[PDB]
Amino acid sequence: KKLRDYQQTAKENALAHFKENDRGQLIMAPGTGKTFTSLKISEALSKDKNGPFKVLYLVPSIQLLTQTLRGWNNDTELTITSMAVTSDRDASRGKASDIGYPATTSSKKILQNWHDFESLPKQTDMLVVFSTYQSIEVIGEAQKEGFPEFDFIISDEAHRSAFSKVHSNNNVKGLKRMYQTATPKIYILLSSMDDESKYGEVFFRMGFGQAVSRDINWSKDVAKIAERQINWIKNKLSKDPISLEFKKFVSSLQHNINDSIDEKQAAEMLSQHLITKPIFEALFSEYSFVNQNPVSQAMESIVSELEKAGFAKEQENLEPLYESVRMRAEGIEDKQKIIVTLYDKFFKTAFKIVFTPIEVVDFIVHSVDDVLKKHFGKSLASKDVHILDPFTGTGTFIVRTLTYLKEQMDAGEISLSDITRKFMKELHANEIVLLSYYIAAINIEATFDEIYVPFEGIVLTDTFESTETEEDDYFGTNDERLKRQQEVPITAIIGNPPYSKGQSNENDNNKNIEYPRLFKSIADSYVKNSKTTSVLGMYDSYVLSIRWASNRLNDKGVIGFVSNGSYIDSQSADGLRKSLFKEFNHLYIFNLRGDQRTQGETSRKEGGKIFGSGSRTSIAISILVKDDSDNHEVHYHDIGDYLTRDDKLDILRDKESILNIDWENISPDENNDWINQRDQNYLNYRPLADENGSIFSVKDIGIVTNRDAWVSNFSKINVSDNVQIMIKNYNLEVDRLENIDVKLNDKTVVDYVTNDERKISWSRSLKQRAARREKTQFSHSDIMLAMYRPFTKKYLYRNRFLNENVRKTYQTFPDKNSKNLLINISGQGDKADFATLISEYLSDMHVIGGQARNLPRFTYETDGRTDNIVSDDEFYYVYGVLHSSAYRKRYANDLKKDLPRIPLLKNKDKYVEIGRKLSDLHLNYENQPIWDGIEVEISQPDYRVKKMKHPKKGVLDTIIYNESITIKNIPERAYEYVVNGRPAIEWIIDQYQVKTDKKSGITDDPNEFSDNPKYILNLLLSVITVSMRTLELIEELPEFEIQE
DNA sequence: TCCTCCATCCAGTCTATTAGCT
DNA sequence: TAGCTAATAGACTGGATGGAGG
């Protein structure tokens, strides 16, 4: 016979596979006949070997053994000598009789039989021993007795205790092992052929669905095929005009989105297209989504010139996935149901976006619609109203918009003729991601079929880069949809703009793209109106989105967004609030809270996260109304404390629009603050620093090393060691840069350096010194003590090099033997309540909250002790006042939003007294007489800590120091003393705990700090009484009154 | 130009508890 | 079973980085 075409393929793949490997599987439907193909494969290896070629064909049943023995000799092109092993003599027959050496179970007979075969005057081409799995051991009994190895071994019906003996050479000596079945999966799941280091990879596969089509969530292979695609390009790139055309394809892509894209990124984008194209075709069934779409066509075009060049789609391995889709999408909102799944099953896993809650999306649509109605008199469906969704994602903000229209049409207020034009001409949206674009298109196209029409209004772009520059084409039809869009007077901008303020440093791949023309817009508006000088947040993507939309909007229109709600009350957003109040007439701000970068009570008050695990930021819905008017007013509502994620959504389903919300009329103040407005009388109080007649001449803010795991630690020795590793690692990168002379820069250097966070913790400044050739010495003298957290003092390598921000610490603590007092305070915009803690040592920025200011008692000079304040009495007076409950409560807003101001109080000398005591207590926090009721049970003297805990949640009576020591009868009120938002006692639990740095793998063990095994236990106990004592003292200081 | 240094807000990820599994 | 793994609920960090002023 002549081997069928796909059999040739299998033969080819087999040979190619066994060229490097020694194990392979062969999957075919029962119909084709793998038995014949196996012979033809065996022949090819026989051709190559140039000697007697030995094959072992293992088989379960007796019927198969005879069907293969006979059927092979008939189909054999070669000279074949056959061997049967079995307890049935008749099993080696065909009519015919004794076909090959007779069947036998006698190993000595099987061994001597091969001696015969060798004794022949002439040996045939290949020797095929057909055997049962049951008696396979006789082969082992033969190969031991003097039988040769097997050049090839074949297991048929491979889904199968001697059945498992084959895999190891120890049982049967053989060079290569092929596995053939039609069903590696046994029907739960009992048996599956997944190598197990035995079955091996598969070089060929045939689906039953294929053959019928051929006329006869586990996907890691997408990597394999893509790696083949991506690599073959870069190779062929190398002056092959394809490179000239593909380098033209990237430039076209670069045009439509970013210079960010290049050979790698662009090639990756086409990979994803090749994979999903058949899925989209399969989904469509009758009418091709691919042929219609511009990007598809643009992608389905560029493939051609490469397809011409001896490059195919390597997705033959992916065909069973395609078949499942073809089955799943045959015939058939039941189609949208598939779109839900395929996304979650395939796409989520395959290549690895934020899913916007429907209750949110619907809310602004109604809100935008009712706004268009009440104000302009117009509506959502008018001819001269255009709607843009600049960050479509999956087109959720369109899908739910046309659904609103559908509800309107059923109510009869709308004509489908009024809908159709919107879908066609008046609805626009765009995405920056390939897969998000496709899915977004379909989902609108499909949800429009409710009443086949492609969506004409979708682009694939970076809306920010759109208005940047105005200057050969691929995708030329794509931007045409956008070019024609750009003349539209867009009356409404809608959606969920991106949130991004930056990164953590060594994720260099991530850094907010520079949009120079938009930054300048931000710079002249939001940044200009600010009083801050630190405006990082104003270049956050969501603030860019408001800017870009504010520009792209027309004088008569509206915006509706779900965004980061930080700008509502934020230090660096005072300018943005000044702008929005001028640039807009009516602004409804719906604060959804849900900020979980807080902690403690604040965290509980914030509550549910609107995007769940999607975002940790404060969320708020903003609808900005723009008309011609002399009227300017803010409308604000706090959704309320403590609400769950779905409690908040229950309100969004309940209230579909901003018409039904009880708004608060807000008149912004001098500081452009909408909420938590300050007291203008508070300004009469004596300034603390930076003004005339201020109490302190100089204030500092806590240190920020930017690499705590390396530079700070409980063990002084560990700091010395760890710092030296990094300094060595850093000076090596420099030595590398030394002998590769270029014009290096503070950012370009990234490509020539390590990026491994187990080696170096890069920061901006450190990169700058690597752009130059700068080395360092390790100065052991620079290792000193510092307050890292309240009542937690670690060792710190304070070094201008390797510390991103050393602040004024060299003025307040010139060396590790210096003597100074500083009053740490919560700084400028903490959400937690205001607190203060005095320190005898250098203080981190996070001693209190996220940004901590400190007020030194002394400043030093190297040319020099200098009084930074008049007297000790004045110093401790300040410390006394900052503890006043009335003071803290009366001006919570001024304490949050700016540096404190101290008034002159009626019983001042009393404030000094308690000021001193409080200081005396908080400095000696680590050794204090234990409180009365407390008891300490110690089984054995194990004073080492792993992690302190309460036996159950919120039992404040007890703390398990470890599995030996426990502390009981702790007064529950001691937890009322709070620094930041956390009790002092809980800081010890939190801080004095064994943990490792996930990034660097640097361990930090608090037991290595103190030399005294009872330090932490002593510290804990003391802090409890410090807590109790502090509260007593806070209750002693006088009634809050003015004017001494 | 580029460096020094003030200033401020961050589109989840880890651990702990409870319920299952052979 | 003893003591794991899986499902579910709870808790909440260190640092990047624009721009004034050299």
Numbering used by the authors: 176 to 269, 277 to 342, 354 to 380, 393 to 421, 718 to 739, 742 to 835, 839 to 858, 866 to 964, ...
Could you share sentences copied from the article?
RM enzymes prevent the integration, replication and expression of foreign DNA in the host bacterium by introducing double-strand (ds) DNA breaks into the invading genomes. In case of Type ISP enzymes, the entire gamut of tasks is carried out by the coordinated action of target recognition, methyltransferase (MTase), helicase-like ATPase and nuclease domains that constitute the single polypeptide chain. Like LlaBIII, LlaGI contained six structural domains: the N-terminal Mrr-family nuclease, followed by the N-core and C-core RecA folds of the SF2 helicase-like ATPase domain, connected to the γ-class of N6-adenine MTase domain and the C-terminal TRD by an all α-helical coupler domain.
In continuation of our study of the mechanism of action Type ISP enzymes, we report here the co-crystal structures of a nuclease mutant of LlaGI and a nuclease-deleted mutant LlaGIΔN, bound to DNA substrate mimics. We chose to delete the residues 2–165, producing the recombinant protein LlaGIΔN. The translocation-active nuclease deletion mutant of LlaGI reported here highlights the modular nature of these enzymes. The structures of LlaGIΔN bound to a 22-bp DNA and full-length LlaGI bound to a 28-bp DNA were determined to a resolution of 2.84 and 7.4 Å, respectively. In LlaGIΔN-DNA, the upstream end of the oligonucleotide was not long enough to interact with the ATPase domain. Instead, this end interacted with the ATPase domain of the neighbouring molecule of the asymmetric unit.
